Amino acid sequence: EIPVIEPLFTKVTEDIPGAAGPVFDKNGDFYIVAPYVEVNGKPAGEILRIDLKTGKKTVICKPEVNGYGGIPAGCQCDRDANQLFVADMRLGLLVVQTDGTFEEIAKKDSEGRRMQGCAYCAFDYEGNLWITAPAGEVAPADFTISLQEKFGSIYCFTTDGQMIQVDTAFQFPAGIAVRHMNDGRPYQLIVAEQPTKKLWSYDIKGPAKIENKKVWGHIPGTHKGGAAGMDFDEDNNLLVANWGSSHIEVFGPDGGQPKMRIRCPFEKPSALHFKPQTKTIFVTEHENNAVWKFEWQRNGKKQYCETL
């Protein structure tokens, strides 16, 4: 029977529709996304900065392109500039500055196909950005999601600036993470397929080059939902938000079944992110549309933005 731990969670902020995309930038500022904010009945999602002492929210960016609003859904911080890479389910991959200005990175992929809306992303230590795209085509196409049909895709945005579609036919691909060798070389890509309760892995052979696709892990529960956001601790244990299960699952480095579970005081953890150089994990959740923090057993895996 999988051991369960029940640490103290502390509320950080609240009232954030669809709270997701927790991230720290290079200065230690903390951000989240509010994907489901609407204006005049249409998408108008937001990227927010959170004051960690008071919980006060500041809107950083409310992305819109040619009158189509964004659904910002997951974030990573860059290394060479203090800017956020934001997966947006209507706009694709955005690069967002702290001053609120932003750019849509690609409208088409390297084969000339229209981009799909993106949900989660993860930098490898070489600076390539691996991205899940569970939505259909970006705005101006009508919004669709691969909850029941297998049209979700996987991308790699390389350091050379190519947006390469590396796989497709996923049923709602969600969290994504890069397992690195001890020497820093990218080794495995892990991809959550949310409703099928599967974690998939590939061997990374280079930028946008994956092979050896296999089922890597299994997500407990039969609840509606499944694996959402995920990230590694510094021992390459993979912590996975199991949306609808009231738990974060903990996988050892070689996957399989969870070796431990973390019980949350809410049903719908959506994403998690470590505060750099600490054991503190920030967790977004959709039961209360709020953000919490708790102490894990060890520090998080160093993010690309902390490397030199």
Numbering used by the authors: 2 to 309
Quoted from the paper:
Recently our laboratory has introduced a powerful mode of photochemistry into proteins, namely triplet energy transfer (EnT) photocatalysis, by developing an enantioselective [2 + 2] cyclase that relies on a genetically programmed benzophenone as a triplet sensitizer. Compared with benzophenones, thioxanthones have strong absorbance features that extend into the visible spectrum and are less susceptible to off-pathway processes that compromise EnT efficiency. Here, we develop engineered translation components to embed thioxanthone triplet sensitizers into proteins. This system enables the development of highly efficient and oxygen-tolerant photoenzymes that are powered by visible light and can achieve selective conversions that are beyond the reach of existing photocatalysts.
To further improve enzyme performance, VEnT1.0 was subjected to three rounds of directed evolution. The structures show that the mutations installed during evolution have resulted in a repositioning of the mTX sensitizer.
